[PDB]
Amino acid sequence: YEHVTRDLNPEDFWEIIGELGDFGKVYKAQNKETSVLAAAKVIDTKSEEELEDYMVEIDILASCDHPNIVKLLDAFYYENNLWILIEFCAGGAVDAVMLELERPLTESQIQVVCKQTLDALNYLHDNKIIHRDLKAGNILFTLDGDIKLADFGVSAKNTRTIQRRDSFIGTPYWMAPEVVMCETSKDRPYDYKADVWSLGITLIEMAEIEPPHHELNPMRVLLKIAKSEPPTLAQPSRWSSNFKDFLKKCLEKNVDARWTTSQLLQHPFVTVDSNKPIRELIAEAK
Amino acid sequence: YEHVTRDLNPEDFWEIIGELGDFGKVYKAQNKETSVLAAAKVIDTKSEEELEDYMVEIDILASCDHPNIVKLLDAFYYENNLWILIEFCAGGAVDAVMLELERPLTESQIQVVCKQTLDALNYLHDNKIIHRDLKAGNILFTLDGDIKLADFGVSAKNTRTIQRRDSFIGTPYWMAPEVVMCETSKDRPYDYKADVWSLGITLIEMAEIEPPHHELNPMRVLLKIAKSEPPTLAQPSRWSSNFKDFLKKCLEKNVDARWTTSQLLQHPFVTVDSNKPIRELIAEAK
Ligand SMILES: N#CCC1C=CC(=Nc2nc(Nc3cc(C4CC4)[nH]n3)c3ccccc3n2)C=C1
Ligand SMILES: N#CCC1C=CC(=Nc2nc(Nc3cc(C4CC4)[nH]n3)c3ccccc3n2)C=C1
């Protein structure tokens, strides 16, 4: 494939140091030549037709070039495994930090994570990518107090389908005006706004350690989302009006009324320019 | 591929009788064993990566089972050509008939074609397929006075992307309510309604031989669609109120207000059950 190496043993290039987490396990790896650190996802594939299922993820990582999105370092197919090697963020996932410290982020910490996460998302949406699995477990801290967005395992990339859709020959007398005007679902915000709702839930998850409805039987959670008004902060006196106002723009069930990442970047809750609160957080867990 | 034969010469199975039309030419073919007739599209492919571009078309033909959609009879890859063999409709395309007779269809003929075309489209939409190139040139007459819809060269099939989208693991606390409720763009009517607008233009094309804006420089046509109110019949006294009312439900620039195929099937303009007018038309061109 475009970005996947064949016929080579990944362990002739990358040395497994340990496990980071657990369709496989994720390892801490170290380049045998350069000492550069990596997370190595090792995905067990039965056949080669399965590689097609993991290729959109790999293409997204390979195609993205943003400070707050993790980079692809290498990928290998070898002895029925797909190895994906991804840049290493030494601070760990936001949710893992909250559980180790046994406390949520403070509001000033949430603003930094929110602001940088929004930058990542805005870039994705601009490039016709929907993340589709945003949560605190997929926001990773660097040693320098910045964040990177990760895990594009179920992301959608609409660039090739937009390319195929904008393609025609001969005079299109029968073309619908919404297709003429580039107002199909691929170019419209509608489907990208699913990420904006998830940002909102991630903000509450960072404010309260666990996401809304964490106490319910898992079988009830989808029903609860459908039935209920959007969630709010449990202890709203703890939080600024700008935090709560930001949330209301994300956690809006009317998708048309819900804000885009572009609109959200102008909100005073993300008008910050220092990661000092995150540097203080990662130093405390060290 | 799933539906494409390799290593076999298509002309050891199918005999070319002549040309029907002109990325290639379309031939009239005859099965050497069974005498069954076929249209043979022979598409020149440079490499094998090009087959991927023609596979959605082939899969649609192979997967559809409807009286008013043309069936796949065979496909072959041989000596750098993709052969697609499609069931034969002995009456030709609706637009070719109008040009040979030098006249449009009558309203009773349009109702039959409309009613059967709508049945085909409704089936497609139910099965998550957008045709994307509906026009009189892709509606074919059978010897019995029925129609079949053809040419899925630029169709979209959203079944595998809906399958991939409905797929998740673990508890989805971060899932947007529109994703919970199955109100993403794949399940919503919005993008399928592009076909409904094109049905409307095809109806006018059948009423007047050529589609709206046929007299303009081709470079102006997309602009004209964007700028103008929806087209109407040029000589509206010639046509019933049910024809004109049907058109208004199709040719509606507000996509939400525009009717679905399902709604259109209940309209009195398509409440017919005899193809006698088309039998009279094809007999006249013979
Ligand atoms: N799948 C997926 C995302 C993910 C996120 C975090 C994770 N565990 C984990 N991940 C990391 N760091 C990490 C993970 C990645 C890459 C997203 C796999 N890049 N950096 C650390 C770093 C330091 C201590 C502990 C860590 N644990 C394992 C997998
Ligand atoms: N591409 C594409 C659609 C198309 C539609 C019509 C066409 N020409 C054509 N097509 C047909 N018939 C036909 C074409 C097909 C099949 C859609 C290619 N099935 N039957 C006839 C039949 C009798 C006299 C003349 C005909 N001419 C050639 C191609």
Side-chain angles (χ1 to χ4, degrees), chain A residues 33-45 47-48:
Chain A
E33 178 60 37
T34 69
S35 295
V36 170
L37 298 175
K41 302 178 89 169
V42 184
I43 306 179
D44 178 38
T45 74
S47 73
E48 188 155 53

Side-chain angles (χ1 to χ4, degrees), chain A residues 256-275 277-280:
Chain A
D256 280 8
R258 192 187 303 160
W259 281 25
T260 69
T261 56
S262 188
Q263 293 168 305
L264 292 164
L265 281 169
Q266 293 171 292
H267 200 285
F269 186 70
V270 296
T271 56
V272 301
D273 64 351
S274 180
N275 63 6
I278 300 306
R279 285 190 268 118
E280 294 174 336

Side-chain angles (χ1 to χ4, degrees), chain B residues 20-22 26 38-39 41 70 86-93 137-138 140 150-151:
Chain B
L20 295 177
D22 174 46
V26 183
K41 302 178 89 169
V70 294
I86 296 139
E87 76 175 313
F88 187 71
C89 297
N138 287 333
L140 309 175
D151 204 351

